[PDB]
Structure formats: structure tokens, C-alpha cells
Amino acid sequence: VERIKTTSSIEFARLQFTYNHIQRHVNDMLGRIAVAWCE
């Protein structure tokens, strides 16, 4: 039995979201380029 302490700044999570979103796109498109290059 314990109480959970919540941080006052959600921004880190939002930052995570942003860093995920962008990277996913590039980590896809750049990858495609590599494949399209190799072929």
C-alpha cells in the first residue's frame, strides 16, 4: 500500500512523442532510400 507521486511536467512525454514521431518517419524514408539506392 503506497501512494504514487505524479510529476508536474508532462512535457517530457510530449517530447518523447515528438522524438518518436519524427524519427519513425525518417527511420522509414531514409531506409527506403538506402534500399532504392542498393537496387
Binding site: 505524479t6 510529476t7 508536474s8 511536467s9 508532462i10 510530449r14 514521431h21
Partner: protein, 45 residues
């Protein structure tokens, strides 16, 4: 993408987290004479 304004606690939530507010307690306490008493009346026998 659209980032909506998000916050865990608002200013009002943080200010309401306090158990006692000096300003509100003083505002209520200093109306006691205006509420439960007649300040203006003067009685002279």
C-alpha cells in the same frame, strides 16, 4: 501535427491544493461585523 495545450495541474489546482488560504479566511472573517452585527446603529440612553 497539432500540439494541444496540456498540463498535469493548472494554476487553480495548485492554489487549491492548499488546505487553508489566508486571503479567503481573512475575507470571510472580516465580514463578521457586517453580517452578524449592526455597525452603524448608536444607542444612547
Amino acid at each position: 501535427h497539432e500540439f494541444v495545450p496540456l498540463e498535469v495541474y493548472t494554476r487553480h489546482e495548485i492554489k487549491d491544493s492548499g488546505l487553508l488560504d489566508y486571503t479567503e479566511v481573512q475575507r470571510r472573517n472580516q465580514l463578521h461585523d457586517l453580517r452578524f452585527a449592526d455597525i452603524d446603529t448608536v444607542i444612547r440612553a
